Design an enzyme around this catalytic site. Structure first.
Site, PDB file in Angstrom:
ATOM      1  CG  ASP A 153      48.196  55.164  70.831  1.00 53.69           C
ATOM      2  OD1 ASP A 153      47.065  55.594  71.700  1.00 53.69           O
ATOM      3  OD2 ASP A 153      49.154  54.269  71.733  1.00 53.69           O
ATOM      4  CG  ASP A 169      47.371  48.755  67.396  1.00 53.28           C
ATOM      5  OD1 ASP A 169      46.353  48.936  67.581  1.00 53.28           O
ATOM      6  OD2 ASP A 169      48.781  49.271  67.905  1.00 53.28           O
ATOM      7  CB  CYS A 187      51.709  33.338  51.535  1.00 52.19           C
ATOM      8  SG  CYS A 187      52.516  34.867  52.114  1.00 52.19           S
ATOM      9  CB  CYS A 222      55.916  32.458  49.487  1.00 50.56           C
ATOM     10  SG  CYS A 222      55.142  32.948  51.124  1.00 50.56           S
ATOM     11  CG  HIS A 261      55.475  35.202  54.768  1.00 49.21           C
ATOM     12  ND1 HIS A 261      54.698  34.868  53.986  1.00 49.21           N
ATOM     13  CD2 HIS A 261      55.332  35.116  55.837  1.00 49.21           C
ATOM     14  CE1 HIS A 261      53.556  34.026  54.644  1.00 49.21           C
ATOM     15  NE2 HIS A 261      54.024  34.256  56.149  1.00 49.21           N
TER      16      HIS A 261
HETATM   17 ZN   LIG Z   1      54.175  34.847  51.837  1.00 47.30          ZN
END
Ligand SMILES: [Zn+2]
Ligand SMILES: CC1(C)O[C@@H]2[C@@H](CO[C@@]3(CNc4nc5cc6c(=O)[nH]c(N)nc6cc5[nH]4)OC(C)(C)O[C@@H]23)O1
Ligand SMILES: CC1(C)O[C@@H]2[C@@H](CO[C@@]3(CNc4nc5cc6c(=O)[nH]c(N)nc6cc5[nH]4)OC(C)(C)O[C@@H]23)O1
Ligand SMILES: [Cl-]
Ligand SMILES: [Cl-]
Ligand SMILES: [Zn+2]
Lengths: 369, 369
Positions: A92, A266, A304, A309, A335
Site C-alpha cells: 500500500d 487484504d 480444515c 487442525c 489456522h
Molecule cells: Zn485449521
C-alpha cells in the site's frame, strides 16, 4: 517469467477466476493477501504463510518508511530478502495509513506532511519508497476520503487522488528498473457516489494501470452500502485487469465482493482476530477463550486441512490463549490464515467449475446458521 | 523399549556421556531440557523444539495443577497429547515453585497448603498429579531450602525433604502403571553444607531412585559457590545413575557442571532471554536490540546451524524485537534453544572423543574474550 500478465480462466456472472503471473511467482485469483505491515505477517514465519496457500502478502509504505526505514531496507537487500519472503509483495502507498495513524498531518496538493509519534509522503516519494522496498505490486499514492463525505468534499478528494494517480504513474515509469520488474495499480475513489466513481474510473483508465483497486470502502459504511457501491463501481473498471478491494474483509464480505467482480483482497482480521481469540470456522467464528472449549478435543474447524487442525485441540488452544502464550497466537493465526486461503481456493474452484452461485449459497447457509 | 536404562558410553575425568533409553525416546546425555512450564516451550511448536535437537522437555506440577488442571489434562489424554510432544517429559514436583510463586503458603510435615493468586501439595498429591499428567520422569516432592540458611535450618529442611522422598517413592511404587512406564528421581538437599549433602545422598541412595538431582542450588549463591558445592556433592550420588542439576544454567555453568559430573540440565534462560532480546553466541551473549545490529546482515551466530541463522539477519531480528513482533520472540527463542543443544552436542562429542578438557578451555577463551 513475465513482469505482469493477468489471465481469466473462467467466469460466472461477474465473478472471475484466473492467475496473475509475475517474476516472483503466480498469484491465483481471487486472491487473499495476508497483511505484513511491519515486515512480518504477525506470529508466522514466511514458510508458514506459504504453507497456508498464500501467493502474495501485503506490506505498507507508511510503516516501513518509519521503521526500519526505506533506504535501510534497500541497503539490506530489499524487503523480500529482509523478511525472507521471496514471492510477490504488494505495498500500500501510505495514502490511507498516513491519515489513520499520524498524530499530526498537513494535507496539500504536493502530498501529506506528518508527525509519526516529521516526514513527507507524496506520489513521487511513495513510489520511490516502494522502489527501495522492491515491491512487486506498487499502489498509487491516493487519499482515502472519510465516510461519510458530502458529494463536494468527495469530489475534491477524488480529483486530488486522480492527479496523484497520474503523478504516481509518471514517477513509476521514470524508474526503469521498477517499470521493468514491478506492476502499478491505480485506486478508484469517489466515496459512495456513482457519478464520482465513474469519473474516477475514467481518469484511471485514461492513465492506464496494470490493475485497479476500489479504494475508499471498508471505512465504516457497512456491508449493505459497500455492496451497493461495488454493484456499480466494479463494472466501471477495465474488465481485463485485476480488481482489488482494499481492506476487505470478513469471509462473507469476500464472497459477496467476488460475486461483484473483485479479484484481490487484504485484511488484518484473520491475523488480528487470531491473536485475540477468534477463530474462523465453516460454522462461523468462535471465541476460543470461551469456557465451552475448555475440554473440547475437536480441532478448531472440523474440515480444515491446516497443520493446526491436524495436531491440536480447541482445549489446548483455549488454554494457550487464556494463558497469554505466544504459541496460542501462532496457532490461531496459522489456522485463520489457512481458513482464509481455503475459502479462496473453494471460491476459485467453484467459479472454474461453474458452481459458484451454489457455493455462495451453501457457504452462507452454514456460516450464519 | 525400556522403561528406563542409563548407559555411560565414555568418561573424561568426572564428565560422562551416554544415553537414557525410555519408552517415549532416547535422551542423549549430557542433556539440556527446554522448559515448558505452561504446557508449551514459549514461542515454539513442539516440532521446532525437536528440530533444535531436544530429546526431552521440562514441565511443572505446580503450574499445570492450577491451569489447566491435572485431572483436566488426564481427561484430555495426558500432557503429551495435549501439547503435541510425544517424547519424554520430566516434571518438576512443585517443591520449589510452590514456595517461589504462591502468594500465601503454609508448610507442615504433611505438605504445603497455598493460595495461587486454595490448594495442597504433598508427596502423594505431587506424584498423583505427575501420574495424571503422564510424566516420563517424575521428580520427588521436596523443599528447596532458601539461601543462605543456617546449618540447623538447612538440616531440618533437608531431613523433611528426605522423609518426603520416601513418601514420594512409596506413592510412585503404589501406582502400578506409573511404576511400569515412568522413572522417579530423588532430589538431594543440604544447602551448601558438605555433611548435610552427604546425609541427603545417603538417604536417597538407601531409598533408591532411577536418577538423582542436585537441588537447592541456583538460588542466588553464585557460580563459585555452586561449583564448590558440586565438587563434593556430585561424587556422593550413585555413579551409575543420571545426575540432574535443577535450574542450571548459563552456558559456562553447564560446562563447569558437566566437568563435575552432571548429566542433565534445565533452564529458562534461552527462552526467557530470547524473548527479551539476548541471543547466545560462541563469542558470548549479544543484545540484539542494540543499535549496532540495525544494519548487520550476519546471522545471530556465525557458526550456528539453526534454521534462524540460515535464513535471517541480525538486522531483521533487531527490527522485530524493537517492534514488539511475535516473530522476533519466535526466532530468538529457536536460535537460543538450538545454541544450547549445539553446546550439549559439542559437550557429548568432546567427552566421547576424549577431548572435553580442551573443548571447555577453548569454549571459555572465546565465549569470554
Ligand atoms: Zn485449521
Ligand atoms: C476490517 C478491519 O481492518 C481494519 C479496520 C478498519 O478498516 C481497515 C481496513 N479498511 C481499509 N479501507 C481502505 C481504503 C484504502 C484506500 O482508499 N486507499 C489506500 N491507499 N489504502 C486503503 C486501505 C484500506 N483499508 O482500515 C484500517 O484498519 C483496517 O477494520
Ligand atoms: C537461572 C534463572 O532461572 C530462574 C532464575 C532463578 O533461578 C531459577 C532456577 N533455579 C532453580 N533452582 C532450583 C532448585 C530446585 C529444588 O531444589 N527442587 C525442585 N523441586 N526444583 C528446583 C528447581 C530449581 N530451579 O529458579 C526459579 O527461577 C529460575 O534464574
Ligand atoms: Cl494483523
Ligand atoms: Cl521461559
Ligand atoms: Zn542460530
Amino acid at each position: 517469467r513475465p513482469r505482469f500478465s493477468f489471465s481469466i480462466a473462467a467466469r460466472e456472472g461477474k465473478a472471475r477466476t484466473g492467475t496473475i503471473e509475475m517474476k516472483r511467482g503466480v498469484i491465483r485469483t481471487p486472491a487473499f493477501m495476508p497483511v505484513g505491515t511491519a515486515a512480518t505477517v504477525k506470529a508466522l514465519k514466511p514458510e508458514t504463510v506459504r504453507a497456508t496457500g498464500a501467493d502474495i502478502i501485503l506490506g505498507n509504505t507508511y510503516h516501513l518508511m518509519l521503521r526500519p526505514g526505506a533506504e535501510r531496507i534497500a541497503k539490506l537487500g530489499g524487503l523480500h530478502s529482509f523478511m525472507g519472503w521471496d514471492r510477490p509483495i504488494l505495498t500500500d502507498s501510505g495514502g490511507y495509513q498516513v491519515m489513520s495513524l499520524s498524530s499530526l498531518t498537513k494535507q496539500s496538493e504536493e502530498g501529506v506532511t506528518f508527525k509519526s509519534h516529521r516526514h513527507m509522503l507524496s506520489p513521487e516519494r511513495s513510489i520511490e519508497i516502494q522502489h527501495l522496498l522492491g515491491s512487486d505490486i506498487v499502489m498509487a499514492f491516493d487519499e482515502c476520503t472519510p465516510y461519510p463525505a458530502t458529494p463536494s468534499r468527495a469530489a475534491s478528494s477524488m480529483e486530488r487522488s486522480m492527479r496523484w494517480a497520474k503523478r504516481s504513474r509518471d514517477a513509476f515509469d521514470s524508474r526503469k528498473e521498477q517499470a521493468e520488474n514491478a506492476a502499478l495499480f491505480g485506486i478508484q475513489q469517489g466515496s459512495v457516489f456513482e457519478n464520482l466513481r465513474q469519473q474516477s474510473a475514467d481518469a484511471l483508465a485514461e492513465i492506464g494501470f496494470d490493475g485497479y483497486a476500489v479504494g475508499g470502502l471498508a471505512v465504516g459504511e457497512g456491508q449493505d452500502e459497500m455492496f451497493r457501491v461495488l454493484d456499480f463501481s466494479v463494472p466501471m473498471l477495465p474488465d481485463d485487469k485485476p480488481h482489488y478491494l482494499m481492506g476487505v474483509g470478513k469471509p462473507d464480505d469476500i464472497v459477496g465482493a467476488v460475486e461483484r467482480g473483485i479479484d484481490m483482497f487484504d485484511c488484518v482480521l484473520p491475523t488480528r482476530s487470531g491473536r485475540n481469540g477468534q477463530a474462523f470456522t465453516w460454522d462461523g467464528p468462535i471465541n476460543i477463550r470461551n469456557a465451552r472449549f475448555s475440554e473440547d478435543l475437536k480441532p478448531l474447524d472440523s474440515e480444515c486441512h491446516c497443520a493446526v487442525c491436524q495436531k491440536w485441540s480447541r482445549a489446548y488452544i483455549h488454554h494457550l490463549i487464556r494463558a497469554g502464550e505466544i504459541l496460542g497466537a501462532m496457532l490461531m493465526t496459522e489456522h485463520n490464515i489457512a481458513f482464509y486461503q481455503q475459502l479462496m481456493q473453494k471460491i476459485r474452484d467453484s467459479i472454474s467449475e461453474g458452481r459458484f452461485s451454489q457455493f455462495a449459497q451453501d457457504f452462507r447457509a452454514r456460516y450464519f446458521a
